[PDB]
Each structure stands twice: as structure tokens, then as C-alpha cells.
């Protein structure tokens, strides 16, 4: 049966949740909760007018349907979501539940052991082989994006500078992605634990660009077959004439296992780019990688993504994912 709502209002907005979450207090519009049924503190978050648009209807649908998706150690999961609404024709307001997350990783560093850097990259390419395995990109991993408790384990999520782990290619409009834009991600944020420093901390995305060049070097002949345009062949190259870095220089200190993962990682060439489960056999992670233990996705019906749908369509879709929710154990 339904259960009995209590309402409140909390900095100008009205909070409408079953009774079972308690003690509601502010931390988008996100309350921590306490959740009578087990006793633990959880994160309420209530979408902002989700179906005022189609842009926002359908960005409420994707949301819904990734957190239910997520069923995996290393990503956040959805462990409730409902609404007031009794009837499809009331439906206005959508409440996603889940773990309460005391810390992100730049918390956590406020310096690593090599084994603690090991242990929070190993569950990032853990995590990231599973959302990979579903055709999804995280595509603004940071560690803000990051929730590490006070035994170093790891959940990816999306709460919504990000330039600083973005993908060369993306910043420079290239044709092509693939799933590897994480892992230049996981790259950057790698490389700022090991020497405590961000590892290209552009002003600007040509700034950023630039500093990218210095180190990983001007696209090779390989890459630069790929490349379509002339004008875009040049323009890489008018950005990589700053006096070239080394990785061995720039990691000096770093565990050479480290450093020569860090090589694999960032590369330009995103065919070329070592992928998240590859980076989970490489001998870095020797004292953690475990391939009975290491698991993919289940299908994830992404055809959704492709459709240009009215309002009333995606609030439907968004109410049949609501009323069909079933708690994890
Ligand atoms: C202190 N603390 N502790 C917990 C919380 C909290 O807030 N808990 C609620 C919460 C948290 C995170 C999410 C979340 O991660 N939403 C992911 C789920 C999909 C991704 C896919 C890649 C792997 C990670 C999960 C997602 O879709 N996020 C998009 C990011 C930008 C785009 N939007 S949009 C669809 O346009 O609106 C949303 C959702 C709800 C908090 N503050």
C-alpha cells in the first residue's frame, strides 16, 4: 500500500516523503534523511520542476533510468525514488533516495600512500568497467565525482574545474569519442594524487590544451591520418610548441608502475588509449585486481536517448519507472 506522506518546508522549498525518512535537514535540493526502516542516514534529493520542459523531461527519464541501472560497488546506487502523486494526472514531483556520502576525494586528500592510490584508482577502473560495459560515459569524471569514506572505498556518481580532467579530443571538438575519455579522466585525477598537484591547470581550454601537448607530445603520424581537416591538423600543431615535459620528470618519485600506467592512459590517440579493463590487469593494481570479481553491466536499453518525444511522453515513461521500482536487498 501507499505510504503516509508528512509535508515540510526547508530553505523556500517544500518537502513532501513518506514518513519512514525523519529528521530532514539541507545539505541542488538534497536533504539528509534518517531512515527509520534501517536505521542508517541517507540523501534525499528533490528534482527541481522536472517536467516544466522537454529538455527537462527527458534529463528527469535518463537520470531515473541510469540510477536504477546501477547495481555495482564502485557506483552509486538508487535505493528509493518516489512521488506524492497518486495518479499519473497528479504526478509533478520526483524524490530519489540514496546513500548519505560524508566526503568526495579532494576531502579525503585535505597526502596518499602508494597503496591508497593503488586501492581509489583500482575501484574508479572497476567501477568504470561496468558503466563501460553498458555503453555508458560518465564523461565529467573529477574527483568532486567521487565519494571515498574513511576506508578509502569508492563510489563514482554525478552530482552536476571540469576542464582540468577533460579529454583532449573533446576539447578540441575532434569527430570521434569513444568510452576512453574516462579514462584520461582517471589519468589526471591519478597523477594529482601521486604528486599532490593538478597536472594541467589550464586557465583556458587552449591553455589547457597547450599543457596537454607539452607533455603527451604533437599528434604522430598515425593519429594524424585520422584527422580530417587541414585547418585542424595546423591548429594542433600551433598548440603544441611549448617546450616539451617528460613523464619520467614529472613523476619523479612515483612508483615506476604508476608512472608507466600513467603512459597508457594519457595518450592522445583515444584507439590507441588503454581501456578500463585493461588498466585493471596492469601490474600496478597486482596486489588488488582479482578477474572473478571484476563484473560488467547487465544490458542497458539505451534506445531512448535517440527520441524526440513530447512532455506528456517522457512524464509517462518517468512515472511507469517510478510505480515499477523495486528496493535493492
Ligand atoms: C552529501 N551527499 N550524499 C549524497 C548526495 C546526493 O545528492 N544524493 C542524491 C544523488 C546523487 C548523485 C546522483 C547521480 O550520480 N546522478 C547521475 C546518475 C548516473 C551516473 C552515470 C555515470 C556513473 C555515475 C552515475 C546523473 O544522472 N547525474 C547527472 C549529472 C548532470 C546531468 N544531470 S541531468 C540528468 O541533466 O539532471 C544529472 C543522483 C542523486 C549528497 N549531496
Same mark, same amino acid.
Given at each position: 500500500?501507499?505510504?503516509?506522506?508528512?509535508?515540510?518546508?526547508?530553505?523556500?522549498?517544500?518537502?513532501?516523503?513518506?514518513?519512514?525518512?525523519?529528521?530532514?535537514?539541507?545539505?541542488?535540493?538534497?536533504?539528509?534523511?534518517?531512515?527509520?526502516?534501517?536505521?542508517?542516514?541517507?540523501?534525499?534529493?528533490?528534482?527541481?520542476?522536472?517536467?516544466?520542459?522537454?529538455?527537462?523531461?527527458?534529463?528527469? &527519464?535518463?537520470?531515473?533510468?541510469?540510477?536504477?541501472?546501477?547495481?555495482?560497488?564502485?557506483?552509486?546506487?538508487?535505493? +528509493?525514488?518516489?512521488?506524492?502523486?497518486?495518479?499519473?494526472?497528479?504526478?509533478?514531483?520526483?524524490?530519489?533516495?540514496?546513500?548519505?556520502?560524508?566526503?568526495?576525494?579532494?576531502?579525503?586528500?585535505?597526502?596518499?600512500?602508494?597503496?591508497?592510490?593503488?586501492? $581509489?584508482? &583500482?575501484?574508479?577502473?572497476?567501477?568504470?568497467?561496468?558503466?563501460?560495459?553498458?555503453?555508458?560515459?560518465? %564523461?565529467?569524471?573529477?574527483? !568532486?565525482?567521487?565519494?571515498?569514506?574513511?576506508?578509502?572505498?569508492?563510489?563514482?556518481?554525478?552530482?552536476?574545474?571540469?576542464?582540468?580532467?577533460?579529454?583532449?579530443?573533446?576539447?578540441?571538438? @575532434?569527430?570521434?569519442?569513444?568510452?576512453?575519455?574516462?579514462? @584520461?579522466?582517471?589519468?589526471?585525477?591519478?597523477?594529482?594524487?601521486?604528486?599532490? %598537484?593538478?597536472?594541467?591547470?589550464?586557465?583556458?581550454?587552449?591553455?589547457?590544451?597547450?599543457?596537454?601537448?607539452? $607533455?603527451?607530445?604533437?599528434?604522430?603520424?598515425?593519429?594524424?591520418?585520422?584527422?580530417?581537416?587541414?585547418?585542424?591538423?595546423?591548429?594542433?600543431?600551433? $598548440?603544441?610548441?611549448?617546450?616539451?615535459?617528460?613523464?619520467?620528470?614529472?613523476?619523479?618519485?612515483?612508483?615506476?608502475?604508476?608512472?608507466?600506467?600513467?603512459?597508457?592512459?594519457?595518450? $592522445?590517440?583515444?584507439?590507441?588509449?588503454?581501456?578500463?579493463?585493461?588498466?585493471?590487469?596492469?601490474?600496478?593494481?597486482?596486489? &588488488?585486481?582479482?578477474?572473478? +570479481?571484476?563484473?560488467?553491466?547487465?544490458?542497458? +536499453?539505451?534506445?531512448?536517448?535517440?527520441?524526440?518525444?513530447?512532455?506528456?511522453?517522457?512524464?509517462?515513461?518517468? &512515472?511507469?519507472?517510478?510505480? !515499477?521500482?523495486?528496493?535493492?536487498?
Amino acid at each position: 500500500e501507499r505510504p503516509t506522506f508528512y509535508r515540510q518546508e526547508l530553505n523556500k522549498t517544500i518537502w513532501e516523503v513518506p514518513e519512514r525518512y525523519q529528521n530532514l535537514s539541507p545539505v541542488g535540493s538534497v536533504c539528509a534523511a534518517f531512515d527509520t526502516k534501517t536505521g542508517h542516514r541517507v540523501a534525499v534529493k528533490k528534482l527541481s520542476r522536472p517536467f516544466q520542459s522537454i529538455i527537462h523531461a527527458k534529463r528527469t &527519464y535518463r537520470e531515473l533510468r541510469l540510477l536504477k541501472h546501477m547495481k555495482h560497488e564502485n557506483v552509486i546506487g538508487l535505493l +528509493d525514488v518516489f512521488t506524492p502523486a497518486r495518479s499519473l494526472e497528479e504526478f509533478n514531483d520526483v524524490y530519489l533516495v540514496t546513500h548519505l556520502m560524508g566526503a568526495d576525494l579532494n576531502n579525503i586528500v585535505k597526502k596518499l600512500t602508494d597503496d591508497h592510490v593503488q586501492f $581509489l584508482i &583500482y575501484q574508479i577502473l572497476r567501477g568504470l568497467k561496468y558503466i563501460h560495459s553498458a555503453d555508458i560515459i560518465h %564523461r565529467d569524471l573529477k574527483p !568532486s565525482n567521487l565519494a571515498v569514506n574513511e576506508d578509502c572505498e569508492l563510489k563514482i556518481l554525478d552530482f552536476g574545474a571540469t576542464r582540468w580532467y577533460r579529454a583532449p579530443e573533446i576539447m578540441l571538438n @575532434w569527430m570521434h569519442y569513444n568510452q576512453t575519455v574516462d579514462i @584520461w579522466s582517471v589519468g589526471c585525477i591519478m597523477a594529482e594524487l601521486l604528486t599532490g %598537484r593538478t597536472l594541467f591547470p589550464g586557465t583556458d581550454h587552449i591553455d589547457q590544451l597547450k599543457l596537454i601537448l607539452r $607533455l603527451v607530445g604533437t599528434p604522430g603520424a598515425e593519429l594524424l591520418k585520422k584527422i580530417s581537416s587541414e585547418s585542424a591538423r595546423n591548429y594542433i600543431q600551433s $598548440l603544441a610548441q611549448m617546450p616539451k615535459m617528460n613523464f619520467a620528470n614529472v613523476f619523479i618519485g612515483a612508483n615506476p608502475l604508476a608512472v608507466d600506467l600513467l603512459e597508457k592512459m594519457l595518450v $592522445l590517440d583515444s584507439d590507441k588509449r588503454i581501456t578500463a579493463a585493461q588498466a585493471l590487469a596492469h601490474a600496478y593494481f597486482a596486489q &588488488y585486481h582479482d578477474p572473478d +570479481d571484476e563484473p560488467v553491466a547487465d544490458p542497458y +536499453d539505451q534506445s531512448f536517448e535517440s527520441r524526440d518525444l513530447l512532455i506528456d511522453e517522457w512524464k509517462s515513461l518517468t &512515472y511507469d519507472e517510478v510505480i !515499477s521500482f523495486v528496493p535493492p536487498p
